Design a protein around this ligand. Structure first.
Ligand SMILES: Nc1ncnc2c1ncn2[C@@H]1O[C@H](CSCC[C@H](N)C(=O)O)[C@@H](O)[C@H]1O
Ligand SMILES: C[N+](C)(C)CCOP(=O)(O)O
Length: 258
């Protein structure tokens, strides 16, 4: 249902390929590899670490984490077609696993992971399900483990304008404030909760991506259609405008179990 909605609309094969063109090979979220390097710059792991990636997409994050640290990485994604694409991009590596499943019904042992990592995925979850997920994450982390998240956030709903309301409604996102998000983590008894509103950084990423799209329009049109170009172009224009005024926000969260 949730699964069917995502597979048949935002994350159709063609939809993901369009996103990948602008985000970067193996990525479906902003900044691609370069942002991932920054997000993980203060994370310490090694070959004995176990990592969970919630909403693993095309697998770029898992590929990088395994490359940088040698860690065991397990990616969960609800879209079967996306997981199929991810599995075609990795071979001969028994420390990278991609699995098609709803994270809300997936079972993991308590005290299992050194790092639980998620990039631009939890926006798809209802508010009730965000709280349920972070309770599960708390159990699944080792005592010494870390939670690391980036996600779409927003200003308070009361402040949304007509265009943003419509965007959120059609995407079926649940966008909360950075502050409400941090409060959920605190309510789940995570420790050392750090939240950052990185909307300015995100704005910079979006501008680079927008410039890339325009400068490679001929290549894009060979691959796709002008209709899809216009949708992407207008989509990024709106996100640049709405991130600048913090109507749509980009949140970073890090916390520990103890
Ligand atoms: N309930 C759920 N369980 C697992 N994955 C989910 C989910 N709801 C949404 N997703 C996944 O979240 C992903 C968002 S796209 C982001 C992919 C990757 N983290 C990257 O940054 O590139 C989608 O692939 C979608 O399938
Ligand atoms: C949400 N996402 C960052 C995974 C994909 C892009 O979504 P959108 O920016 O087109 O709404």
């Amino acid at each position: 249902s949730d699964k069917t909605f995502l597979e048949n609309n935002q994350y159709t094969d063609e939809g993901v390929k369009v996103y990948e063109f602008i985000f970067g090979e193996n990525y479906i979220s902003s900044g691609g590899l370069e942002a991932t390097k920054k997000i993980l710059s203060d994370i310490e792991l090694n070959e004995n670490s176990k990592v969970l990636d919630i909403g693993s997409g095309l697998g770029g994050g898992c590929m990088y984490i395994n490359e940088k640290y040698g860690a065991h990485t397990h990616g969960i994604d609800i879209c079967s077609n996306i997981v199929n694409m991810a599995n075609e991009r990795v071979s001969g590596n028994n420390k990278i696993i991609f699995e098609a499943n709803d994270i809300l019904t997936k079972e993991f042992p308590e005290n299992n992971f050194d790092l639980i990592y998620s990039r631009a995925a939890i926006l798809h979850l209802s508010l009730e399900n965000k709280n349920k997920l972070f309770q599960k994450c708390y159990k699944w982390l080792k005592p010494t483990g870390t939670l690391l998240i980036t996600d779409y956030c927003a200003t308070e709903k009361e402040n949304w304008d007509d265009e943003f309301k419509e965007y959120v409604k059609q995407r079926k996102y649940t966008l909360i404030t950075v502050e409400e998000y941090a409060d959920i983590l605190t309510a789940c008894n995570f420790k050392n909760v750090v939240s950052k509103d990185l909307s300015d950084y995100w704005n910079q990423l979006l501008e680079v991506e927008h410039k890339y799209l325009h400068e490679n329009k001929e290549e894009f049109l060979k691959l796709f259609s002008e209709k899809k170009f216009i949708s992407l172009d207008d989509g990024w224009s709106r996100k640049i405008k709405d991130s600048k005024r913090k109507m749509q926000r980009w949140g970073y969260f890090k916390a520990t179990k103890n």
